[PDB]
Amino acid sequence: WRYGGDPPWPRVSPACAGRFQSPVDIRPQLAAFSPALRPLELLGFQLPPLPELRLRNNGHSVQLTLPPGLEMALGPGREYRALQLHLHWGAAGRPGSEHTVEGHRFPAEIHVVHLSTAFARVDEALGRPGGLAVLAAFLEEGPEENSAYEQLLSRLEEIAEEGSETQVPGLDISALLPSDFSRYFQYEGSLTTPPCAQGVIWTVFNQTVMLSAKQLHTLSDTLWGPGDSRLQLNFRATQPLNGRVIEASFP
Numbered sequence: 001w002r003y004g005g006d007p008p009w010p011r012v013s014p015a016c017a018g019r020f021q022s023p024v025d026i027r028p029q030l031a032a033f034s035p036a037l038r039p040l041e042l043l044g045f046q047l048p049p050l051p052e053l054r055l056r057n058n059g060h061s062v063q064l065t066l067p068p069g070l071e072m073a074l075g076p077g078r079e080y081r082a083l084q085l086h087l088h089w090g091a092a093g094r095p096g097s098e099h100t101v102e103g104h105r106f107p108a109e110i111h112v113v114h115l116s117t118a119f120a121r122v123d124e125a126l127g128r129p130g131g132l133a134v135l136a137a138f139l140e141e142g143p144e145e146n147s148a149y150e151q152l153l154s155r156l157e158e159i160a161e162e163g164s165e166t167q168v169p170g171l172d173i174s175a176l177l178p179s180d181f182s183r184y185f186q187y188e189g190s191l192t193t194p195p196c197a198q199g200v201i202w203t204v205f206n207q208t209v210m211l212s213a214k215q216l217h218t219l220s221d222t223l224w225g226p227g228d229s230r231l232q233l234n235f236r237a238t239q240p241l242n243g244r245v246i247e248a249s250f251p
């Protein structure tokens with residue numbers, strides 16, 4: 001599969017034609033205030049430098065593989081372990097977030113993909129209710145170099161070629177996300193690439209993460225994908241809610 005053309009994703013995986021897909025357009029006025037949505041809790045995200053982590057250009061994103069021991073809870077008894085994180089972005093003067101807010105597309109987006117502690121492996125969790133959970137935050141331009149992001153972005157030149165990888169020192173993985181874990185939207189949807197399995201709990205933070213202009217340009221201008229193509233605009237079009245109601249943790 002690829003962004004932009006064939007093969008049609010439903011031929012790759014029938015689940016890509018499900019009724020309840022991601023990403024979606026978030027309309028805050030239509031979101032349901034749900035006070036059971038408590039602040040997200042992360043444990044073990046502050047990593048030592050060794051052992052190193054693998055950072056890979058997989059042709060459709062840059063993905064950092066996360067080690068064992070990163071625990072995340074959506075609430076009491078809703079426990080998960082982090083597997084990996086990756087990014088979605090646009091191109092010179094064009095935004096490339098997956099989720100939108102009232103039609104607004106943000107420059108870029110981070111996804112941190114987690115596996116329910118009830119499952120030993122991802123393949124067993126695919127399509128099961130709440131088997132996977134993704135934390136999603138928008139990346140916007142701020143005035144300062146983001147030092148946590150710089151640790152990844154400074155290494156993209158080493159992995160410019162499709163299918164290449166490098167090792168990076170461990171870092172505070174929570175520093176790639178907003179400091180506000182209280183205010184967010186949450187809904188049930190799908191993986192945004194094949195196999196597009198449903199039952200995924202998506203949490204999209206209110207607060208955004210700030211990268212420099214230079215950093216955003218590095219993200220979108222360094223990596224190459226399938227063929228001789230720049231790896232850019234690597235986002236799926238928004239999918240209709242089709243009757244799902246997005247919940248918000250704040251009125």
Ligand SMILES: Cc1ccc(-n2cc(-c3ccc(S(N)(=O)=O)s3)nn2)cc1
Binds near residue numbers: 192193
């Ligand atoms: C055997 C196996 C191993 C890994 C996967 N995984 C697929 C994925 C993902 C696809 C799309 C996303 S995303 N853009 O966050 O929704 S995460 N994450 N793990 C699926 C099957």
Ligand SMILES: [Zn+2]
Binds near residue numbers: 088192
């Ligand atoms: Zn993603």
